[PDB]
């Protein structure tokens, strides 16, 4: 794994590369860099479907197995870092976070392009 996910002022990288996409593309909640750092599952979910809908216009907020969905997109997607259960149950712990908001800003870049 080639990414310095310890290094704290990388993870905030990320976290204020999410905040800006979320704030300049007209995400519908109030975010910042202070409710971005460690979210909800259902936060994250929301984040997650505003995100995955510029590439699948018509897609719906999971919930029911969400654990399952989720990796299973960016596996598709060709995502090559593992995301696993373990990691959805617990998107925003503190060892946990920056991997998931890794993920969100790859992402991001795969929108910004295509």
Not at 77 to 89: I, Q, V
């Amino acid at each position: 794994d080639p990414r310095p996910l310890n290094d704290k002022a990388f993870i905030q990288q990320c976290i204020r590369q999410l905040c800006e996409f979320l704030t300049e593309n007209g995400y519908a909640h109030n975010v910042s860099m202070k409710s971005l750092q460690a979210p909800s599952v259902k936060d994250f979910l929301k984040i997650f479907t505003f995100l995955y809908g510029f590439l699948c216009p018509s897609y719906e907020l999971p919930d029911t197995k969400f654990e399952e969905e989720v990796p299973r997109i960016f596996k598709d997607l060709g995502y090559p870092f593992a995301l696993s259960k373990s990691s959805m149950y617990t998107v925003g712990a503190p060892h946990t976070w920056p991997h998931i908001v890794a993920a969100l800003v790859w992402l991001i870049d795969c929108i910004k392009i295509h």
